[PDB]
């Protein structure tokens, strides 16, 4: 009836995996397959181990939070959950770490010069001689507006501009494939 349990060798604990191990010697007679009682002794041993684990797991500090309505993934304030320590049982990794980084021949030149990373503030930029901003990327682009203008004041020039844009795109793809080669 009492929840107390003890063994000559204290049970090892890994609360992060919710696992426990018992080094105490097993009784070979109780574990024999021929015995009709073999299931009962194993059940009692598993019950004692689960009781020790519950005595350990119940002592762990529990998180609490006041958030209750509109939490995205927070636990309910009525709810309480154990703070599991990170597991002590190391396990093999599923995949090798993605260590195949490459400078792509540009970061080295940037380190060799004063060039700095782009501001990453936003694609939007004000259009000239216009009352509304025209984004340079990710939407209707001012660079493509040159094709839409009614006159170029100069073979169609718009076809030459599209050819230059395709040339820049193919050069970027070629540099990407060249960095893929290394």
């Amino acid at each position: 009836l009492p929840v107390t349990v003890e063994k000559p060798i204290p049970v090892v604990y890994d609360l992060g995996n919710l696992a426990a191990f018992d080094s105490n010697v097993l009784d070979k007679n109780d574990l024999d397959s021929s015995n009709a009682r073999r299931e009962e002794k194993i059940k009692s041993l598993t019950r004692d181990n689960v009781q020790l684990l519950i005595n350990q797991l119940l002592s762990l500090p529990m998180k609490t939070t006041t958030e209750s309505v509109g939490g995205t993934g927070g636990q309910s304030s009525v709810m309480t959950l154990l703070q599991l320590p990170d597991p002590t049982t190391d396990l093999p990794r599923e995949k090798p770490l993605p260590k195949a980084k490459a400078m792509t021949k540009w970061e080295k030149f940037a380190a060799k010069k004063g060039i700095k990373p782009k501001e990453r503030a936003g694609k939007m930029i004000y259009d000239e001689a216009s009352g509304e901003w025209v984004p340079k990327w990710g939407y209707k682009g001012a660079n493509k507006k040159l094709d839409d203008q009614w006159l170029v004041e100069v073979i169609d020039p718009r076809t030459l501009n599209r050819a230059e844009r395709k040339r820049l795109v193919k050069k970027n793809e070629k540099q990407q494939r060249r960095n893929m080669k290394n």
Binding site: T4, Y13, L15, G16, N55, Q56, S59, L60, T66, E67, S68, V69, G70, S76, S77, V78, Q83, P85, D86, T88
Partner: protein, 413 residues
């Protein structure tokens, strides 16, 4: 977001080790919201659960039409009408047979819960907008008679009302300024605050003659309250909610519920408290002495509300410093200071079990504290604007709140 710093690796190595093994009537707290109830297009100014059941409720607002609500269905029920100005306040009779409200206009209108129709011609006489109301306790009332309805106005006059005749049986003008509130105690002596920095106990039994005038506050009194106010308001409606079989049984149950709290110290002497703008509060025993038993103090800004615990063991008051402060109900000694609100508190309502205290503030997120642990229990966000008012059902099954968002909201476990 500034997340709590990660535990040090030594703390993790310590946590990995076995630790902290040691072989060696109640109300469910509110914790969740409910669907919003659309209604009159004006900010809610007040709310009050029906004493006999949480399913019924009523709220004032800036709209002239007060709206009773069916909390079980979260839908409007028999919307009130007749007033031509804002419904500054609402209150239910302790017997529950009649509703009462105070409009910003001088007129006052009783209402019948069964249909919501006005109960006769509106009460009139006040020279200024109504400030507060206080129904006469049922235990003082003789059987077979409707309780009298106290009233107050910005002029500072008070007029006891006979609900049957719809006439002011008595009147007084002893306050030179606005009466912030009034309450009908169970001892038969009336008490009320005033804007004149004075309080005056009154004996209704002596034709309304005054008997004492307190004078300790440095600033105008606000929200006068009493330890017995919960029993005087519930009307002998126990949490089970069963109606008494006879009015005499209601009178006996009310006298018993009053004696159970009045004799907590072995003698019938209800405690009294008076909030003030001077960042101070004073306990009062007018029958015992004309001077405060203690000078509660500590708030950094003017208190906005006070509410004795239903058992009377604890005192608590709202404040503009964004920190509710608990106090002992027997001597006013400081206990603990609640914190968490980002803006000035407006009002609070004790739970029927006394183990919790729902609260609200100018911040949109109302909160409720577990007084037993002296710590916040659970936040209740959802209101789109300030939560001007909150109240707890006498049975504790549900909670209601208003605000500037014009969206009444209910809360329950």
């Amino acid at each position: 977001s500034t997340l709590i710093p990660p535990p040090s690796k030594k703390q993790k190595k310590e946590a990995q080790l076995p630790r902290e093994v040691a072989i060696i009537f109640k109300v469910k707290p509110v914790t969740r919201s409910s669907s919003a109830i659309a209604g009159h297009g004006s900010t809610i100014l007040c709310s009050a659960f029906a004493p006999h059941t949480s399913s019924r409720m009523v709220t004032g607002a800036g709209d002239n039409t007060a709206r009773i609500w069916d909390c079980d269905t979260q839908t409007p029920m028999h919307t009130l009408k007749g007033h031509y100005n804002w419904v500054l306040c609402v209150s239910w009779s302790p017997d529950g047979e009649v509703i009462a409200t105070g409009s910003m206009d001088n007129t006052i209108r009783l209402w019948d819960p069964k249909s919501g129709q006005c109960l006769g011609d509106a009460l009139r006489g006040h020279s200024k907008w109504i400030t507060s109301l206080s129904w006469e306790p049922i235990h003082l009332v003789k059987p077979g008679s409707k309780p009298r309805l106290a009233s107050s106005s910005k002029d500072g006059t008070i007029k006891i009302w006979d609900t049957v005749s719809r006439v002011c049986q008595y009147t007084m003008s002893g306050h030179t300024n606005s009466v912030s509130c009034v309450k009908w105690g169970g001892q038969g002596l009336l008490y009320s605050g005033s804007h004149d920095r004075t309080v005056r106990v009154w004996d209704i039994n002596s034709q309304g003659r005054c008997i004492n005038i307190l004078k300790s506050h440095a600033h105008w009194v606000n929200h006068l309250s009493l330890s017995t106010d919960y029993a005087l308001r519930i009307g002998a409606f126990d949490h089970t909610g069963k109606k008494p079989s006879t009015p005499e049984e209601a009178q006996k149950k009310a006298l018993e519920n009053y004696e159970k709290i009045c004799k907590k110290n072995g003698n019938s002497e209800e405690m009294m408290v008076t909030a003030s703008d001077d960042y101070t509060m004073f306990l009062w025993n007018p029958l015992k002495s004309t001077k405060p038993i203690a000078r509660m103090t500590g708030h950094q800004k003017l208190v906005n509300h006070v509410a004795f615990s239903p058992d009377g063991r604890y005192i608590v008051s709202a404040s503009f410093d964004n920190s509710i402060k608990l106090w002992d109900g027997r001597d006013g000694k400081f206990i603990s200071t609640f914190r968490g609100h980002v803006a000035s508190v407006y009002q609070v309502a004790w739970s029927s079990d006394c183990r919790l205290l729902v609260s609200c503030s100018k911040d949109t997120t109302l909160k409720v504290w577990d007084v037993r642990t002296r710590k916040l229990s659970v936040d209740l966000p959802g209101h789109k604007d300030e939560v001007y008012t909150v109240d707890w059902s006498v049975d504790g099954k549900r909670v209601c709140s208003g605000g500037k968002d014009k969206m009444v909201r209910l809360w329950t476990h």
